[PDB]
Enzyme design. Structure first.
Site, PDB file in Angstrom:
ATOM      1  N   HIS B  39      13.097  26.450 -29.799  1.00  0.00           N
ATOM      2  CA  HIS B  39      13.982  26.127 -28.517  1.00  0.00           C
ATOM      3  C   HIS B  39      13.472  24.917 -27.638  1.00  0.00           C
ATOM      4  O   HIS B  39      14.323  25.000 -26.718  1.00  0.00           O
ATOM      5  CB  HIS B  39      13.540  27.689 -28.492  1.00  0.00           C
ATOM      6  N   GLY B 141       5.650  32.002 -19.001  1.00  0.00           N
ATOM      7  CA  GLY B 141       5.759  30.996 -20.201  1.00  0.00           C
ATOM      8  C   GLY B 141       5.151  31.263 -20.832  1.00  0.00           C
ATOM      9  O   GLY B 141       3.904  30.286 -21.534  1.00  0.00           O
ATOM     10  N   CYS B 143       6.218  31.487 -24.815  1.00  0.00           N
ATOM     11  CA  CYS B 143       6.832  31.246 -25.698  1.00  0.00           C
ATOM     12  C   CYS B 143       5.800  30.376 -26.085  1.00  0.00           C
ATOM     13  O   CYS B 143       5.049  29.552 -25.262  1.00  0.00           O
ATOM     14  CB  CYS B 143       8.158  30.987 -25.148  1.00  0.00           C
TER      15      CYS B 143
HETATM   16  C1  LIG Z   1      16.515  35.751 -26.977  1.00  0.00           C
HETATM   17  C2  LIG Z   1      17.830  36.053 -25.732  1.00  0.00           C
HETATM   18  C3  LIG Z   1      18.139  37.054 -25.106  1.00  0.00           C
HETATM   19  C4  LIG Z   1      16.998  35.190 -24.593  1.00  0.00           C
HETATM   20  C5  LIG Z   1      16.846  34.216 -24.626  1.00  0.00           C
HETATM   21  C6  LIG Z   1      16.854  33.253 -25.168  1.00  0.00           C
HETATM   22  O1  LIG Z   1      17.516  31.816 -24.574  1.00  0.00           O
HETATM   23  C7  LIG Z   1      15.284  32.141 -25.456  1.00  0.00           C
HETATM   24  C8  LIG Z   1      15.411  32.071 -26.628  1.00  0.00           C
HETATM   25  C9  LIG Z   1      13.883  30.956 -26.676  1.00  0.00           C
HETATM   26  O2  LIG Z   1      13.693  31.395 -28.364  1.00  0.00           O
HETATM   27  C10 LIG Z   1      13.361  31.354 -26.291  1.00  0.00           C
HETATM   28  C11 LIG Z   1      12.294  30.755 -26.472  1.00  0.00           C
HETATM   29  O3  LIG Z   1      11.693  30.668 -27.546  1.00  0.00           O
HETATM   30  C12 LIG Z   1      11.257  30.019 -25.744  1.00  0.00           C
HETATM   31  C13 LIG Z   1      11.196  30.790 -23.988  1.00  0.00           C
HETATM   32  C14 LIG Z   1      12.678  30.568 -23.605  1.00  0.00           C
HETATM   33  O4  LIG Z   1      12.349  30.994 -22.290  1.00  0.00           O
HETATM   34  C15 LIG Z   1      13.017  31.638 -25.126  1.00  0.00           C
HETATM   35  C16 LIG Z   1      14.959  31.827 -24.226  1.00  0.00           C
HETATM   36  O5  LIG Z   1      15.347  32.235 -23.119  1.00  0.00           O
END
Ligand SMILES: CC(C)=CC[C@@H](O)C1=CC(=O)c2c(O)ccc(O)c2C1=O
Lengths: 273, 296
Positions: B39, B141, B143
């Protein structure tokens, strides 16, 4: 909401095994000194066996400070982080790196209870495990574990070897006092519930500090300090809920019930971060 | 009995910061590969219906800023494996621990090292819910934060964080980029299936309650496996299987309490509540300790 511990990496590289005769516990190796409970001698440098992984360290000097034994060794620890020795107050939180005979086993987030114990849960050989907070790469060491109390909880010192709470490092019957609930931490966690999504427990009522404390003490809750009100003022600003109206939600919550129990191991500071 | 996370030092030494244009995530630096969620190559638009093969073919090595503390890493190769980006770099990571990649199943536990912008922020202990989600506690953040277990100084990586679900829970993949559950790295209306209690974890925790002090919840009754499941699924408990009974066998032996007796105990507990009593150190039945954890 999940309680999190601090990452334990900087403290992991400081944990050694300290063995005196038949007894073994954990020690903390910072610069050229190893810190550990003095209980390990129940002497000259040579009968202290200190191992940092596969190496053995040579004790070249020993010294006591209150209930902590200070072992000087030949080498400084190249993994030493920036660190301070601090002493925390009941209701403040910290992370513990539980260790067994030198090897870090796990890590968890604590609060120093108001009766000066920590509801830790401990390996057989976790003596000398330390508790710490980390701010911007600086380890604040605040706890060294010594004992389990007959009631399943734990007692220990600061890193200058001063006990938290009315305990001695002798095998006398000692017991925790009646533990209370950390009122200011429940309130932070109710603010965190409104700062997130939950606001069903809010009400239109307020209460006074005195009338709240009389309600609180009967359910074994710490009294609430006018400083406790001040510290929670940032969160009152962020959410629009005055501290004495959150107290009315707490007072009512203490009589009707409805996580599903009220968490008291998040400080106000914890919630802001 | 405090839930503990694994010491996080071996994973701390692997966290990096991955940036693509205006998108910054956490990445995982092992040997000479940085792993992160694909992403990171998405923009403002893109999020609703991204074509990741299209956006990736358009990328060069030098569009990826990878930072490890104060050092920028030179990317010298890139490649997509399912929903994970894999960047080849100059330098092997000197702090790379002994590691492996594994895929875990609902009900298994692990630790999550939650990071922001590449710096570790906290560690917590976790169960994969039956619906394949995580009840994480994620800063803005987080992720690319990864989940893991550690056994004899070997790090098994099993989770990488991708997204937060509209209900407040978290979805991710294994380190080969295959999602857990029926989720896609896409901003569409996807919902977690109904979450249920991990029954085999509560029974293991109940045995841990016996091996310590408490026996107050025990009772005279026993039960059949089928009769147990019919009652428990009325409380949104996961059906117990023969596999689960077999798995609890060891703790049954150590306590001389038969599995289906413990089941009868749990039936009564679900019927009655705690009556303000406490089992280990909780007024809630705890389902994030596995039978494997309880032994250790
Ligand atoms: C999945 C959803 C219903 C809404 C958010 C989507 O857009 C999203 C997917 C994603 O995979 C991701 C990351 O992997 C890392 C950060 C990050 O913000 C994101 C995302 O926002």
């Amino acid at each position: 909401f999940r309680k999190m511990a601090f990452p334990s990496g900087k403290v992991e590289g400081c944990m050694v095994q300290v063995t005196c005769g038949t007894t073994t516990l954990n020690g903390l190796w910072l610069d050229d000194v190893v810190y550990c409970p003095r209980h390990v001698i129940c002497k000259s440098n040579h009968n202290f066996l200190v191992q940092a992984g596969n190496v053995q360290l040579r004790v070249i000097g020993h010294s006591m400070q209150n209930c902590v034994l200070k072992l000087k060794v030949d080498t400084a620890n190249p993994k030493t982080p920036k660190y301070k020795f601090v002493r925390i107050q009941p209701g403040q939180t910290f992370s513990v790196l539980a260790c067994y005979n030198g090897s870090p086993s796990g890590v968890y987030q604590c609060a120093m209870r108001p009766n000066f114990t920590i509801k830790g849960s401990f390996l057989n050989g976790s003596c000398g495990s330390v508790g710490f907070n980390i701010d911007y790469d600086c380890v604040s060491f605040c706890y060294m574990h010594h004992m389990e109390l007959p009631t399943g909880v734990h007692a220990g010192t600061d890193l200058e070897g001063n006990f938290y709470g009315p305990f001695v490092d002798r095998q006398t019957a000692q017991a925790a006092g009646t533990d209370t609930t950390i009122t200011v931490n429940v309130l932070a966690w109710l603010y965190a519930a409104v700062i997130n999504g939950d606001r069903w427990f809010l009400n239109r009522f307020t209460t006074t500090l005195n009338d709240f404390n009389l309600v609180a003490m009967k359910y074994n809750y710490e009294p609430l300090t006018q400083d406790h009100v001040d510290i929670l003022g940032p969160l009152s600003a962020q959410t629009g809920i005055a501290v004495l109206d959150m107290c009315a939600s707490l007072k009512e919550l203490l009589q009707n019930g409805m996580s599903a129990l009220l968490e008291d191991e998040f400080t106000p500071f914890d919630v802001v971060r």
